[PDB]
Symmetry: C3
């Protein structure tokens, strides 16, 4: 009887931050209640000021990271306000049946729905909108996020000993396909319906115009750079709902990586770069050993540095000259 289980309500937070949770489950299985409100909105995605009509869960690209434990039930209230124009739904890759919930959650503007599913498999998983006939358009307009289903006894290393993270961040990587004309300029559209065919044509090139973290070029830089201290253990959850990516921490490693994101498997050790296939979430654990600026990138470096898939960590602490040093600084002989 699900009615006999504890209920807990979670208020979600904006990526790259993650709602408060416990790694090791302090209660028995629970029904965990989430609410998301769909927001269609204009978003500026690059330094040039290119503005798209984005489709979002909870006002952000990506949608927020949900965190539960294995064999919890997820109960999502999904609200489509009448200020929106399109039909939406949600498909959880964590869920079993009914197209991941998509068949049960179709909401027109002015409607809401509540879905419950049992999180039977531990791992990080993508969720995304998937309305019949228009799936890639919604996903590539930003309507995707992730859910983490932790093992009830938390994460474990390749030998089965505990791994505990001190901080967690969620990086959602988004491929956008802004339509271009013969000259190569971005085309502009008045209504979603007038945009649709050109959006399909742009998608069929399989060549994104932008590939960004947290919804825009430079979103995870400057005042919004990720932070850590030397010695801290950081988990970075990374998703890509549509297209392969290959994350890399410039100056660091993935000490333990679940590249395809599923915690019953042993992690890969000491990775430089890891492949997260399109339609997947992955997770990487790293202990910082040096201070300074790190770049966190998709290591197709054109995708990173020309198309947008690059963010920064600012790390505080002591410099270790045993690990790295300048022996002779750049100079003319």
């Amino acid at each position: 009887d699900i009615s006999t289980l504890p209920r807990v309500k979670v208020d979600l937070v904006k990526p790259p931050f993650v709602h408060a949770h416990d790694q090791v489950a302090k209660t028995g299985p629970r029904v965990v209640e989430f609410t998301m409100t769909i927001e269609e909105k204009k978003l500026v995605i690059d330094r040039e000021g290119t503005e798209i009509h984005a489709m979002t869960f909870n006002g952000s690209v990506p949608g927020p990271l949900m965190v539960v434990h294995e064999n919890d039930y997820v109960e999502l209230r999904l609200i489509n306000p009448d200020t929106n124009t399109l039909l939406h739904n949600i498909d959880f890759h964590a869920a079993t049946g009914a197209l991941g919930g998509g068949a049960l959650t179709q909401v027109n503007p002015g409607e809401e729905t509540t879905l419950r599913f049992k999180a039977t498999k531990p791992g990080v998983f993508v969720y995304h909108c998937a309305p019949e006939g228009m799936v890639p358009w919604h996903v590539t307009s930003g309507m995707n996020g992730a859910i983490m289903v932790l093992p009830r006894d938390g994460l474990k290393d390749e030998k089965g000993q505990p791994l505990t993270y001190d901080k967690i961040y969620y990086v959602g990587e988004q491929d956008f396909y802004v339509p271009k004309d013969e000259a190569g300029n971005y085309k502009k559209y008045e209504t979603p319906g007038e945009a649709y065919e050109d959006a399909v044509k742009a998608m069929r090139t399989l060549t994104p115009t932008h590939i960004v973290f947290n919804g825009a070029v430079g979103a995870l830089t400057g005042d919004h750079a990720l932070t850590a201290a030397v010695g801290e253990r950081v988990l970075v959850v990374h998703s890509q709902a549509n297209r392969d990516t290959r994350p890399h921490l410039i100056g660091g490693h993935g000490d333990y990586v679940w590249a395809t994101g599923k915690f019953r498997n042993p992690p890969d050790l000491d990775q430089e770069t890891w492949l997260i296939p399109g339609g997947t979430a992955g997770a990487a654990f790293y202990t910082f050993r040096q201070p300074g600026v790190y770049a966190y990138v998709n290591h197709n470096l054109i995708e990173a540095f020309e198309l947008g898939a690059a963010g920064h960590f600012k790390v505080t602490g002591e410099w270790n000259d045993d690990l790295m040093t300048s022996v002779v600084k750049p100079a003319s002989m």
Copy 2:
């Protein structure tokens, strides 16, 4: 002495079905005899009626799945009838030496050949045509399939206990490169030779015009949807001879996955989506837990829903409300 071994003749079946076989070997090592007849033919590949000159093993795209056991010998009689126009051969990724057999199997129209090789490594493997100088053209015109070399004691899980499948299907995913003009219309050609340079130019874009399962958009839908019952254990073998893919069962999982298809390795557990690199076959095992329609897709969703890489499962049985339920059906408040 190979002449002292049992011989068995197999008659192949059209994908996505697979010839009858035993998972656990009921005889000692055998010579397993297969015959394939090459057929060059017109094929309609999409709903628009786009027709290509396809190159096939046994009349289908993909070619049929061959199944043997580790350390069996495969003896293939390959027939190129005089109704065909081109030179063909075959390269087995399962085989050792002579370019996988390609150096030994070159047949002009009106010729045949018989190759024997020892299947020394267990796994699912690609086979494809590979005539010197024209390899990608033949492979991307459909001339590829797969072979499964089962361990003699069948499949095993990550802990070494038996995994037995109830049903098996073979999904071959094909990237086509139909030449386009400046306007973006598909060009049409009278002879293979007149097509060749434009085919090469289209291939060099690295952007497929179509990506399909079982030879056409929608081939694994409707009356030809895959089927299962709740509780059945299904193995899906998936190959891609030329280009990476990332299969996903919408509403399900890969419970046990050999993403790069080789059975001496432990399977990955609980996958949402798995990467099968171009030039590889993989295999995924799933036990259905919910009825209804599932979509089986390449989770580049543009590739799936715009370019063709999507099929369906129709699953019969009981709905489990513990696993998933609509709490409040879509409605206006």
Copy 3:
């Protein structure tokens, strides 16, 4: 005290060859001294005579393979002669801190620098130039290589028993983006600065014009084919600093593969084809069992046979008819 450790100087060799080293460490931890001189030079990259302005470490594409043992220190003297025009640096994926050394190694023409880092993680790793603001241009102009950090007790199999290679080769795979005009002809440029914007535009297509091994179409063929004898154990280290690749030995296998290149992990067994993500080095171990010509390719076969990512092995020794034989040679019935 690092000053108390042995020092050894290594003189590097041109790929695909590798400097002499010992698999199992015969000394304690050492400081291993390398020197590289940057050379900007014209290179002919294809059979058509297309000539680019290449940027190289030590005069080659890829840069040379460096080999050390876990917890050795790498001390690199990097020289940028005044005959060069651009600013360069180096980022080691093996290193920890300061953008892999990139923040500490910026050298203008006429300058040099010496970096030291501790090789704390065993595996094969990419190194590449990464000057702020111009990273992908330098990497995709050839300025990348790899470093192998061997475990001190050498390589081990999936069960922890020793694997010893008899020969080692280094294959660097390079994606080039030669700018094209409306007609599709390669554009030509007088100075690096006049080339830059068109280089960026060409990179943003995400469609390489050339994908080559050892710096040119056909570089690892003919008189420069790789060689082995039947029974020899060969390690092939393969890197791709920017773009995914999927190596395959046509007629063979990867007996033991570290696809993402990190030796604390067990190898994948019996691979047909393996995915090395962009920004990664991998390693594959194979024991040759048949003589003849093998092709070693990226198994996107368009990338291999149209764009250049194909080389040869010439293997000497006895033919094994048990493994493969022609039963009936091609003939007309």
